[PDB]
């Protein structure tokens, strides 16, 4: 059935976005002895060009990858496209062992595992949303606005986070209008997008109105409709973080799985990067949290590779 | 004397480093108004080529600002070349101001500041320690350690991680001698350098020998030689945080300026990045700060702008 290397597997990297990829490059330049397995849907996929990762500042995302695959396999380490769905412990605290099983069979053991699995965004039942989604029905203003900058923008009120979405949308243009949607808003609410002179147009969204592939507004339940050239949307964001959960890392109050600041969970030996456990992590952010668990995999690594050594020589002693 | 713009700075942040760029690029992205201050002193300028950043492994540091500095020129940052020798607070909690002050008069007035001085590589004074760092006389094994995988690699006993540091580079090399330079070894120190086939040669070294342009050993107080090809040290290693310190930036019980997980100070407006608050911060990841700086800081520069909004439409009141 599965996968072995006769020196064994020392981390098993689980998802390959910028997250996984930086520390797998960390780890195979220490000579770590690195598998990557990845299930090929990169979150930011929908979007052409991505903005704001020093140096790379409107790379295409599958170019990133690319030559970042490229750099990490340079170095020995090896790649498999497929999907992980379970991940089991062994072994005590102080040397732990895992065993990595794919859909479809195959199985690995490492030392350590990474995992980098993201999140994915739960949009709306709207009809044009998924379509649209990533060309000019957005979420993140960071990403996007500059590119949509003064032009007339819109907010769905599909989400408690809307109003402070409308509000954030404002620094990238003076026209700004949310569709409430239903929305409750409360007094604060109302009081803070009238004075950010953010307009609230009241009803029941139909659906996205495109004509030769562009967005050019918003349809109301009784066929109204407002002129938009860009809408964005909070999406409900779920961490893929059912390994972790399995694995029995611990939650922290805000429901997000909890880390250190390299990434270390509550269960030995067991890292989390990127979009799993942040929400707010774009992409350098990932990587950069990519190459701090490396960092600290590797010297707990040691740790543990001096510990054995010492145990050893002094049962054999002489 | 001073440096002014009509709308008013948004933010100032000092260091150019990926630290800053990277801050620089998202706010600026966000149309703040931002001017970067750096003095030119990248820590990794002695080494060639910077190894480990996702898709710009092997690039030149000088190669990396170069195109750092123009993606964020290209989005109206603008830079000064200089040295920040102050930085003072104004107005109340809730609507931070600062006075960035240069070595020669120049002073700007700016509503943030986000520090990214990084830190300062205390070496041991033997002769050609200078001279080689960077080249051959080396601290970080994630930066260098591949590059010189399995060579003769020896660890100067002139800090007390020095042992740990000759045990972390056993990962790189079989063949890794420790000088201990009168360094005071542990029992256990002792034991762990044993198991991991650490020799441990005593005696002061006199000087690096340097011939053709390259290390070829160390040499001790009576005139023994060890030939090696690279030879590592664990620097002092001290934040440029005067500045911090300066405006009260409580320190945690570790003695770094204590910040947040998106880098926020103790003091309200003022943010840090990179080796400044963190020694273990590779490139990357210091970038990776930069942006999670600037995610929170644009975030709350507008709660307060709406804040204010509020504040002056409740004023006038229609
Ligand atoms: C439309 C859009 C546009 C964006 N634009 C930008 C931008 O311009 N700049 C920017 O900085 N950020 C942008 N972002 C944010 C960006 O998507 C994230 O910062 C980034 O994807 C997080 O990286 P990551 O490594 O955590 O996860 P991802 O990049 O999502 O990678 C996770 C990987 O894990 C794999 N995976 C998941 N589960 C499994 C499993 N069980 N087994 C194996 N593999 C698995 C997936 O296939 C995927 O390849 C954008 C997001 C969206 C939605
Ligand atoms: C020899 C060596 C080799 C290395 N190789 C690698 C490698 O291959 N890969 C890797 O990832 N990392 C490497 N590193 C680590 C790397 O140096 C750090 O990760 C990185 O420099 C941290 O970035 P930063 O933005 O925090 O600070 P820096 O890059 O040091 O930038 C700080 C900037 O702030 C400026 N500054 C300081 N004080 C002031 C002031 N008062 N006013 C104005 N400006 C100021 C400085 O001039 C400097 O330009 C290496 C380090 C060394 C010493
Ligand atoms: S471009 C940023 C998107 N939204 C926000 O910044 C507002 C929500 C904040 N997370 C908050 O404080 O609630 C976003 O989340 N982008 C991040 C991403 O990973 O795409
Ligand atoms: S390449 C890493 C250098 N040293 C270590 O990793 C060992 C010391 C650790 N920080 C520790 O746990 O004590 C180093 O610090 N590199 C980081 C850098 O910013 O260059
Ligand atoms: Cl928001
Ligand atoms: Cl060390």
Redesign the interface.
């Known amino acids: 059935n599965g996968f072995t290397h006769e020196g064994g597997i020392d981390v098993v990297v689980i998802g390959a976005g910028?997250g996984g990829?930086?520390a797998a490059?960390?780890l195979a330049?220490?000579?770590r002895r690195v598998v990557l397995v990845d299930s090929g849907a990169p979150r930011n996929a929908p979007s052409a060009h991505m903005?704001?990762?020093?140096?790379?500042?409107g790379?295409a995302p599958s170019a990133?990858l690319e030559?970042?695959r490229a750099?990490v396999s340079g170095?020995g380490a090896e790649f498999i496209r497929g999907e992980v769905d379970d991940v089991e412990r062994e072994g005590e605290d102080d040397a732990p062992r895992f065993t990595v099983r794919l859909v479809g069979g195959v199985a690995l053991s490492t030392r350590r595992v990474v995992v980098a699995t993201g999140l994915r965004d739960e949009l709306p039942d709207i009809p044009g949303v998924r379509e649209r989604w990533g060309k000019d029905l957005l979420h993140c203003?960071?990403c996007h606005?500059?590119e949509v900058?003064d032009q007339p923008l819109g907010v769905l009120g599909t989400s408690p986070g809307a109003v402070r979405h409308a509000?954030?949308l404002?620094?990238?243009s003076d026209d700004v209008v949310l569709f409430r949607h239903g929305l409750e808003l409360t007094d604060d609410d109302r009081?803070?997008l009238?004075?950010?002179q953010v307009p609230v147009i009241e009803g029941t969204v139909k659906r996205l109105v495109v004509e030769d592939d562009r967005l050019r507004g918003v349809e109301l339940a009784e066929d109204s409709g407002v002129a938009r050239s860009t809408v964005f949307v909070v999406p409900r964001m779920v961490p893929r973080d059912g390994l972790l959960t399995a694995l029995g890392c611990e939650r922290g109050a805000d429901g997000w799985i909890a880390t250190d600041?390299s990434g270390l969970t509550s269960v030995p030996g067991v890292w989390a990067v990127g979009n799993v456990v942040d929400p707010?992590?774009?992409v350098?952010?990932?990587?950069?949290?990519?190459?701090?668990a490396?960092?600290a995999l590797?010297?707990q690594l040691?740790d543990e590779?001096?510990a054995s050594?010492?145990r050893?020589?002094?049962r054999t002693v002489a």
Do not use: C, I, K
């Open positions: 910028a990829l930086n490059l960390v330049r220490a000579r903005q704001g990762f020093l140096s790379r500042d790379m990133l030559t970042g750099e170095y203003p960071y606005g500059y900058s509000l954030l404002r620094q990238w009081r803070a009238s004075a950010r600041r707010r992590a774009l350098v952010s990932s990587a950069g949290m990519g190459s701090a490396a960092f590797n010297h040691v590779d001096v050594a010492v050893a020589a002094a």
